[PDB]
Symmetry: C2
Subunit: 75 residues, 2 copies
């Protein structure tokens, strides 16, 4: 019996399904319950988040300029 190949395949399959559930717990608003749809919404969620990190760190630098401009106008 080639059994240890059948069991090893069973653990891999289990580890991945464990990961899918953890993915479902952090990605907001998924409604088609299929696996392909899950990954699709995950990719979109990641793009949206890095896009926001870039806009916020930029807005912060920009407001740091106005503060510096007004200190200079002061005196």
């Amino acid at each position: 019996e080639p059994l240890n190949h059948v069991e090893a395949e069973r653990q891999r399959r289990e580890k991945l399904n464990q990961r899918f559930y953890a993915l479902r717990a952090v990605v907001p608003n998924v409604s088609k319950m299929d696996k392909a749809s899950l990954l699709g919404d995950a990719i979109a969620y990641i793009n949206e988040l890095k896009s926001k990190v870039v806009k916020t760190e930029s807005e912060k630098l920009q407001i740091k300029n106005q503060l510096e401009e007004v200190k200079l106008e002061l005196a």
Copy 2:
């Protein structure tokens, strides 16, 4: 239908795994499972920075309004 139908489902999935590698940094020759694990870790690092940066921004916006007030007096 039925062999062909299964190839279409399998292909739809495999396309998406590869795209996942293209949006997360440093995950090139990894396992499918470790890939999903790091995607989760990266989503967590990403929200975390959004919160921290927005905190820093407010601290600076409060400071701006104070000097605006000193300027107009």
